[PDB]
Fold this protein.
Amino acid sequence: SMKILVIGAGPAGLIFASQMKQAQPGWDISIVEKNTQEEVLGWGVVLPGRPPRHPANPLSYLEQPERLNPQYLEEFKLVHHDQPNLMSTGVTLCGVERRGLVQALRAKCVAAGIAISYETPPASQAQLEAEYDLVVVANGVLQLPPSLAPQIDFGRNKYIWYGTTQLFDQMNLVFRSNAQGMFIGHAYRYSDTMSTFVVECDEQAYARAELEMRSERDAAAYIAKVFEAELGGHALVSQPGQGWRNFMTLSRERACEGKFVLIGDALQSGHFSIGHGTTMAVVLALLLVKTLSADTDPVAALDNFNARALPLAHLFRDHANSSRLWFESVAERMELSNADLTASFDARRKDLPPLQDALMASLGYALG
Ligand SMILES: Cc1cc2nc3c(=O)[nH]c(=O)nc-3n(C[C@H](O)[C@H](O)[C@H](O)COP(=O)(O)OP(=O)(O)OC[C@H]3O[C@@H](n4cnc5c(N)ncnc54)[C@H](O)[C@@H]3O)c2cc1C
């Protein structure tokens, strides 16, 4: 009935393509990827709940998720002035390698008859709307209708995504104050051997530590020294070309214009300090499939999607931004007790409508 093009072979468009073709096996679903097949950004990611019971976890859509060596975390460890504070997590946290997750999802799509072409060249907007009935934009953070234009915001802190062989058995959140400034580590094990170790700092700490001038090797050794107590001699490794950045929060005022509809980070990115990015890609992928299924008029489904997607994407943005800003000012909270800092941390999103209730409601509609 329909010829859909998926732009971007990451979790958003992969979950969409497979779940769509599973709901509509006759449709012609194809995926194009900008990069080579081998290039996958990042190290590990933390995901909600365990497969296969938790519908927002992308592992719940792989037949044998345990073959990706996921790690299930039950504790949260907040370290302040070297004191640990150990809490239960509310939900099991699921760490998994980002590469294995992406490639298993791609393999799932290929086995369903969904072609994925790599290193694709850019196509006119005109070329695509002649060539296709719907263009699912899922290229993460190109030519699109003017009303889909993005609002971009750069966070104040600088961050870098490290990997390390230090094993962080709990979800770790580490605060370390330097003669140079305030450094924050987000760390958690995702495999038998590897942990994610995301470091953000103050723009003044970035300047006083001279991080822009140092070599990558020098900067990593300095940060590993800062977190000496957490890393125990293990170094820090970044991916080629993935240095220090300001987090880019991309928002949009409409989810779809014409035959272009957006999902994933391309529709809304949000700071990683709430760990919801891949969760949102799944939830909104599953949302799009349900609108494209429930009603038979495409345009009428897209207007159903845009009125359902956008409140959800913006509540996500509000929660991530509330968390991001707290981490941008946390230097002023450093004299607090561990207990007082933890209470501050737990309340940083409390003024908003609960995100989790909104996500469960949307999943209830997209899955019945
Ligand atoms: C430091 C950091 C830590 C994070 N930690 C977590 C975490 O713990 N848990 C979590 O769930 N999320 C985490 N995230 C977020 C997570 O990486 C993303 O939110 C998630 O990948 C979004 O999926 P997506 O498919 O929308 O985008 P992407 O994963 O970026 O996929 C988009 C794909 O499209 C491709 N593409 C780009 N442009 C084009 C084009 N023109 N044509 C075709 N293809 C194109 C890209 O190369 C990419 O392969 C983190 C992010 C950062 C930066």
